[PDB]
């Protein structure tokens, strides 16, 4: 990325197509992170996600808790 | 017997011993008996002294032999049995004391207890 | 996240270049800041992916919960 | 104010997918300005070959010769810098003392011993002096280092008399990146724990100069063209214990025992006129500082935890005591006997001469050290004032050279109470009084004696007189 490209930039001025690579590798960096999916900051997503593991606490605990009240015929 | 820790205290904080005699006239009722006066502290200030000469303190002495009872310092330090402990550095400064003392002349003690000054002498 | 880690992750790579060609081609405080904003992105680049996984994880077990529950409820 | 002009506007004037036409096209055209291509062990990872480039350019840069085989390994041309880590000249050398200190994350002590060094080895000769004497003297200063070991070696009793105390032997590896060592300071006081000696691994006999306080001592000079040997001579084995100094020959060496005295503690004259005696004229030709000794050094000493805020303590030295408050002063400003005012040394020349007669010339100076240590411990952070209760004002006078005493109006009395103070010993500090023959008995036995000298503090040994001679 950043010092990737700047280390080659300083070992060989230090005294051929670089440019190109660097923004086919930037290019592709920028697909990736917009195919992953997540556009907005992680605070909402982490925020969602606890919300999704308290609901999957309760329906265990509800499941649980039907198990036990077993007093039929 | 107050008049030691007196001095203690006025020793004890870094007075500019010509202040000293406000404290001093304040501290006593100002003409009861000067015979407990400057004249014994130079004997008790350098009896814990020993083999040093206890300065910072020989300035109270200084500013007091401009007019004060020059008998009784004469006397004390003259029955003073301080070449018998032969410190040899402390007598330095006796002698320092009695030069500016009796190198120009003694005071008048409008008595006859003068003649016993000479006696002292 | 990923598409704002990605975005400061080009900017300060963009801007790391820049300053590279221009000190190259002419002969302390901003080189330090985007080092922190690219180990920032890298760091939030990681924790996306974390949280993509986890977030895998939690639809699969919420899925079997809501399969459990209707279940259940049938 | 803003950085808007970072990522907003620069990357559209940076002069993409046709845009890389800079490396043929365009190319028809530092030391601390532009650090960017400097600074390239901090932008990648630290390799091999990443601080071998910074070192060539920056050799190249300030002008050394200096090349190898190909790119990957490169030692350093010099006298004896030629070591590889994990013959014109010194012989081939492979020791640890240059492959220990870099094994697995070393990254400091790489660019400023070596520097350091180099820059030592530095004087008005021309290919006469400034690699020929620098050599000789580089090979010179290794007897005194291996008659120093030995004589450790010998002294097979303990090291805390032998090591630190009494004579010199707590020296380490005089080559490189490290020059030789000994115990200048005398610290007597421990961590903040008990004084356990050999942290995780240090078992050699040696002592170097990491555990607590050590000094460093080199031998480099410039102008310094006395009479001395140029090569190390004394270096067998002694009959029983140890030998003197023998020499031859005896030439004139352009250099010094410059060493790198830490802290500029103040001397007396009597260390002057012992090096006015040694190597011909005295270790320094510049206006003596006579200025305060003791109440300069006290704050130099002390200085070290003292925060930007200014102190202005004035001769005062309120602290504490073992359950209570306390103060102190220093008698300044007191002409003791001597007439004058005692004499300052406050300066860093530690340009001492070959291994002569300097069989004390360190424990006088330690014994100083200590005297100084004494007195100053009362002052280092404690600002109290306005205290009601205690208050024990002292003033510590030193009337004789490297004599000091304490009167304070001890409450264990209703009178003063003095103590003589006197660094007879190097460790061995004397701690009699006179007392007199009509005074109270709040003067202990000698066994408040050696138990203050044991504590080694103005402070801890008043409030220890105060409470055990006391003891009502």
Not at chain 2, 23 to 50: C, H, R, S, V, Y
Not at chain 4, 222 to 230: C, G, Q, V
Not at chain 4, 404 to 427: E, Y
């Amino acid at each position: 990325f950043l010092p990737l490209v700047h280390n080659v930039i300083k070992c060989m001025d230090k005294d051929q197509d670089l440019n190109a690579l660097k923004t086919k590798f930037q290019e592709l960096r920028k697909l990736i992170g917009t195919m992953p999916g997540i556009h907005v900051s992680p605070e909402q997503q982490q925020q969602q996600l606890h919300s999704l593991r308290e609901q999957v606490r309760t329906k265990n605990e509800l499941l649980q808790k039907y198990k036990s009240l077993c007093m039929f015929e | 017997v107050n008049l030691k820790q007196a001095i203690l205290q006025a020793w004890k904080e870094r007075w500019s011993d010509y202040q000293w005699a406000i404290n001093m006239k304040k501290f006593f009722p100002k003409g009861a008996t000067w015979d407990i006066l400057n004249l014994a502290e130079a004997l008790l200030e350098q009896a814990m002294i020993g083999p040093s000469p206890n300065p910072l303190i020989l300035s109270y002495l200084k500013y007091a032999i401009s007019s004060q009872m020059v008998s009784c310092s004469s006397v004390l330090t003259a029955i003073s049995k301080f070449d018998d402990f032969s410190r040899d550095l402390c007598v330095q400064a006796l002698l320092d004391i009695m030069d500016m003392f009796c190198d120009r002349l003694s005071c008048h003690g409008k008595a006859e207890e003068c003649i016993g000054l000479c006696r002292a002498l | 996240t990923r598409e704002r880690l990605l975005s400061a992750l080009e900017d300060l790579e963009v801007l790391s270049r820049e300053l590279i060609e221009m000190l190259a081609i002419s002969r302390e405080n901003q080189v330090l800041e985007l080092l922190i904003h690219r180990d920032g992105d890298f760091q939030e680049l990681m924790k996306l992916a974390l949280n993509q996984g986890k977030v895998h994880h939690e639809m699969q077990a919420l899925e079997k919960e809501v399969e459990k529950r209707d279940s259940d409820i049938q | 104010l803003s950085k808007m002009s970072s990522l907003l506007e620069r990357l559209h004037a940076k002069f993409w997918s046709e845009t890389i036409k800079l490396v043929r096209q365009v190319m028809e055209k530092q030391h601390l300005v532009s650090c960017l291509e400097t600074l390239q062990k901090a932008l990648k990872v630290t390799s091999l070959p990443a601080m071998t480039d910074r070192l060539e350019s920056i050799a190249r840069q300030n002008g050394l010769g200096s090349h190898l085989s190909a790119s990957g390994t490169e030692c350093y041309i010099t006298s004896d810098m030629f070591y590889v880590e994990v013959h014109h000249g010194e012989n081939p050398v492979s020791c640890p003392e240059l492959v220990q200190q870099l094994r697995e994350k070393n990254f400091e002590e790489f660019s400023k011993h070596l520097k350091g060094l180099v820059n030592l080895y530095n004087l008005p000769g021309d290919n006469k002096l400034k690699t020929k004497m620098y050599l000789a003297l580089q090979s010179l200063e290794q007897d005194l280092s291996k008659m120093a070991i030995m004589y450790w070696k010998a002294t097979n009793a303990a090291p805390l008399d032998k090591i630190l105390h009494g004579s010199v032997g707590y020296l380490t590896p005089r080559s490189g990146g490290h020059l030789m060592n000994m115990k200048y300071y005398a610290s007597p006081s421990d961590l903040l724990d008990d004084k356990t000696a050999s942290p995780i691994i240090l078992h050699e006999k040696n002592v170097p100069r990491s555990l607590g306080m050590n000094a460093s001592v080199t031998i480099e000079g410039t102008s310094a063209m006395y009479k001395l040997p140029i090569a190390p001579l004394i270096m067998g084995s002694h009959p029983a214990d140890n030998k003197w100094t023998p020499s031859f020959n005896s030439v004139d060496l352009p250099a010094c025992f410059f060493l790198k005295f830490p802290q500029p503690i103040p001397v007396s004259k009597a260390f002057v006129q012992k090096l006015q005696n040694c190597t011909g004229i005295p270790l320094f030709e510049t206006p003596p500082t006579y200025l305060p000794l003791y109440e300069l050094i006290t704050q130099f000493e002390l200085s070290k935890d003292p925060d930007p805020l200014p102190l202005n303590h004035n001769m005062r030295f309120y602290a504490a005591l073992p359950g209570q408050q306390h103060c102190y002063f220093l008698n300044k400003d007191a002409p003791l006997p001597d007439g004058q005012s005692l004499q300052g040394t406050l300066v860093s020349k530690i340009t001492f001469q070959h291994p002569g007669r300097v069989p004390l010339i360190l424990n006088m100076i330690r014994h100083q050290v200590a005297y100084n240590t004494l007195i100053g411990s009362c002052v280092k952070r404690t600002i109290l004032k306005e205290d009601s209760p205690g208050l024990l004002q002292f003033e510590v006078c030193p009337l004789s050279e490297s004599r000091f005493s304490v009167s304070f109006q001890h409450p264990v009395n209703d009178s003063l109470v003095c103590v003589v103070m006197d660094v007879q010993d190097s460790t061995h500090v004397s701690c009699k009084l006179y007392k007199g023959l009509s005074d109270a008995l709040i003067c202990t036995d000698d066994f408040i004696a050696k138990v203050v000298q044991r504590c080694m503090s103005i402070p801890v040994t008043m409030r220890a007189i105060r409470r055990k001679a006391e003891t009502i």
